């Protein structure tokens, strides 16, 4: 199985929306899933890669790949597996049924900033791999792509959050040399509280 | 004789003042050993997008004379009559023709949820120089970001707080912020980040 990581464009909006759908189902967040295709598409038309909302898509194919910003070329990795992958929804994630290319995952990230370094960084909002393609290295590949891109661009940090009880995730992040800056707490002003500011 | 104040967008000419403000913040926080910010770094990173599309700075400025109309909220400041002891005012004056002094800043940028239709803002820093504190300026800076979010149809404003800073937590709760207690910040930096460049993808 061949794999490639590439920047999403507006034509990828349906796949990204379906990936977020699956993610919301898995994470039990469907009640707050209000993002729309047209909202996503607007953002993808509006956003300069790496300077705003950015998506990398992971695609897989049984045949090799051909090989949207000055600062990027696609990442690649071949795999091996004569295990059948049962993916009956593959058609819903395929930009090309002639060549059997299937979207298997994504990462959504955007720039943050270290005032102390005067350097941008990246914050990873989400990494999602569809269930049939898990435990094959793809999620790690998506994280790697963001890290590599940061280094390429001279960015200072890559950050994200973890659930304080998710010991498996914590250990994984620590193993790759991430630090858990465990005293900070996220604060959020939304809804009527936010609207009160006028 | 009241002090007048305004909040305005930083432009490239403000780079020296932003540098000095971050430096003072590092001094106040006793983290000067971690400060390696440069003017050229600020200049080349802060102004690559239009305001509000990426990194955005609002500056707080004060004057003993009024500001002509050209992001200052509803002007709810106090202690404006008090003498200012500001020996560094010369270092924070954008124009020696006038008596305008830069007194603080907020640095923020868009964030995004996968699930929710609207973007938000994340606030990286709010700092008011010591001589100008307890006049409402810091609250005004936070207010300016919140009102900008409402104006642009953004759904949330976020930041972090230290878990032991009960006074700050109570202040945020008083304005209706929630503390999302389950999350921990993870950070890949330095050699651990650089190590990823060796991965052949």
Swiss-Prot record, chain B:
Major location (coarse): cytoplasm
Gene Ontology cellular-component annotations: cytosol; nucleus
Binding positions for acetyl-CoA per the UniProt entry: 126-128, 134-139, 165-167, 172
A Pfam family annotated for this UniProt entry: Acetyltransf_1
Keywords attached to this entry: Acyltransferase, Cytoplasm, Nucleus, Transferase
Chemical reaction(s) catalysed: an N-terminal L-alpha-aminoacyl-[protein] + acetyl-CoA = N-terminal N(alpha)-acetyl-L-alpha-aminoacyl-[protein] + CoA + H(+); L-lysyl-[protein] + acetyl-CoA = N(6)-acetyl-L-lysyl-[protein] + CoA + H(+)
Limits of the N-acetyltransferase domain: 69-200
GO molecular function terms listed in the Swiss-Prot or TrEMBL record: N-acetyltransferase activity; protein-lysine-acetyltransferase activity; protein-N-terminal amino-acid acetyltransferase activity
EC nos: 2.3.1.48
Residue numbers annotated as active site: 172
Matches recorded under InterPro entries: Acyl_CoA_acyltransferase (IPR016181), Diverse_Substrate_AcTransf (IPR051016), GNAT_dom (IPR000182)
Expression (tissue specificity): Expressed throughout the plant.
Subunit architecture: Oligomer.
Similarity-based family: Belongs to the acetyltransferase family. GNAT subfamily.
Record protein name field: GCN5-related N-acetyltransferase 8
